[PDB]
Amino acid sequence: AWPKVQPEVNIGVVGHVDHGKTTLVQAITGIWTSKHSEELKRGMTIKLGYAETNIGVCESCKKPEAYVTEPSCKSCGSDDEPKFLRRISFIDAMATMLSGAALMDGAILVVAANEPFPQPQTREHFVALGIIGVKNLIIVQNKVDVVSKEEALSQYRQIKQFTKGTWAENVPIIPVSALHKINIDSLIEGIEEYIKTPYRDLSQKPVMLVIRSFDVNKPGTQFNELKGGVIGGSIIQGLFKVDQEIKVLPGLRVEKQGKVSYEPIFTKISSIRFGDEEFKEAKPGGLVAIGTYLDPSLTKADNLLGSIITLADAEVPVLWNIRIKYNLLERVVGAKEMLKVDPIRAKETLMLSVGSSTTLGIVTSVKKDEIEVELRRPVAVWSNNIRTVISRQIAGRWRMIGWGLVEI
């Protein structure tokens, strides 16, 4: 039989075509993931469509057809059980995209074969991928069945030529039709070869990125049957177990009269869940639901969005001022034209995304490789050289202008 495991990897899927990405995930998993007729499964998405699937392989069948997402090889003429490879999860495509982005172990960038390459959205998405550090990439040429072999091949060469000078020079290009299911087994193969499961040091301190929180107690719930608040997020390192003492950072915003501060919120894990399966422990990969003993007022309606969770005794600096070793883009994708990126300037306001968090800050110091920033809200910095996305409001819209590492 195949094992019931948690996903071990998150793969972001970002695309121009909007009946693209969802149909793509569906082409992999086989099931419709738009209006899941069971909100009884808490909440895990933040309006980010999410899906899990097993991946396996019939060793004796020709690849790529040998790849299956189910424990049957009848499709390649065997009654034997395919080898189970792994369970993967997908995250379907400003603060919100950043938050989704924090969780991807890899990505698939989808382009429409019946559209000139590159579409505006395509280049935007590409830049975005470069900024967030997700370099495990696959480009999918979707809807290749509505253009000829020749047109698809032409666009393939254009994309390769486009990538030839960049870091994405060797990213594979995989033609598929998500809607009509053509050549899907090749993409699963591609996901296996090019979006490998990252190294996990499971001795590392447990860290979870929190991306949702909800009060799951339904109306009419009797008071004595109330469950504690639930925190949904993505574990980015280490592992958590039920009954471990943990804390939420920055935690609770507390106002003493004429004062403001954040005090970490301590609680205990009551339950760990991936989809509709319960687990005894939770590791990186997939979206996890974490039961707590928290007052649901604390989790009600994503109150805790952007927080992180660590063990209670974890030592994690919560900082209102941060130093960032940064790198800016040469220029920015715009409606009409590429836009020159002015160097950082003191007293200007930037947006910094750290993990699943997004906070406004004032620049207090500017050097060539480093800036210092005063934050409107504090950040939990769980490790040195955490990546940050630096954004500036340009033309009345927030745009990612570079990235950096917070240095402690």
CATH code assigned at 140: 3.40.50.300
Which of 281, 315, 349 is a domain's end point?
315
4, 109: one domain: yes
Which of 200, 234, 253 is a domain's end point?
200
Q: Which domain holds residue 328?
A: 316-408
- CB-based contact 401:391 (threshold 8 Å): yes
Residue 51 pairs with which residues in a beta bridge?
Answer: 90
372, 311: one domain: no
193, 211: one domain: no
52, 164: one domain: yes
Check residue 218 and report its DSSP letter: P
Task: Count how many residues are written for the chain.
Answer: 408
- CB-based contact 234:102 (threshold 8 Å): yes
What CATH code is carried by the domain that includes residue 340?
Answer: 2.40.30.10
Obtained via which technique?
Answer: X-ray
Query: Binding residue per annotation — 18?
Result: yes
Query: Binding residue per annotation — 19?
Result: yes
Residue 232 pairs with which residues in a beta bridge?
Answer: 212, 289
190, 231: one domain: no
Report the C-alpha gap between 201 and 238 in whole angstroms. Answer: 7
Query: Binding residue per annotation — 23?
Result: yes
Check residue 197 and report its DSSP letter: P
Query: Binding residue per annotation — 356?
Result: no
Please give the resolution of this entry in Å, rounded to 1 decimal: 2.5
Rounded to the nearest 10 degrees, the angle between the axes of helix 18-29 and helix 184-194 is 90
- Identify whether 64 is preceded by a cis peptide bond (ω within 30 of 0): yes
61, 168: one domain: yes
Report the C-alpha gap between 285 and 88 in whole angstroms. Answer: 8
**Chain-centre distance of CA 35, in angstroms?**
20
Query: Binding residue per annotation — 177?
Result: yes
Query: Binding residue per annotation — 43?
Result: yes
Residue tagged 């948690």 (tokens): 6
- CB-based contact 297:253 (threshold 8 Å): no
Q: Could you tell me whether strands 370-380 and 229-237 are parallel, antiparallel, or unpaired per DSSP bridges? A: unpaired
Which of 138, 166, 200 is a domain's end point?
200
121, 36: one domain: yes
Query: Binding residue per annotation — 145?
Result: yes
- CB-based contact 13:93 (threshold 8 Å): yes
Report the C-alpha gap between 216 and 230 in whole angstroms. Answer: 7
Question: How many domains are contained in the chain?
Answer: 3
**Chain-centre distance of CA 56, in angstroms?**
23
Q: How many CB atoms lie within 10 A of CB 179?
A: 17
- CB-based contact 377:360 (threshold 8 Å): yes
Query: Binding residue per annotation — 142?
Result: yes
Q: How many CB atoms lie within 10 A of CB 364?
A: 15
Virtual torsion, Cα 111, 117, 122, 123, nearest 10 deg: 150
320, 265: one domain: no
17, 55: one domain: yes
Residue tagged 């419709």 (tokens): 32
185, 72: one domain: yes
In Å, what is the CA distance from 344 to each residue of 132, 378, 398? 19, 21, 15
Query: Binding residue per annotation — 144?
Result: yes
174, 49: one domain: yes
Backbone phi, psi, residue 97, to 5°: -65, -40
Query: Binding residue per annotation — 339?
Result: no
CA end-to-end distance (rounded Å), the chain? 48
39, 182: one domain: yes
Query: Binding residue per annotation — 45?
Result: yes
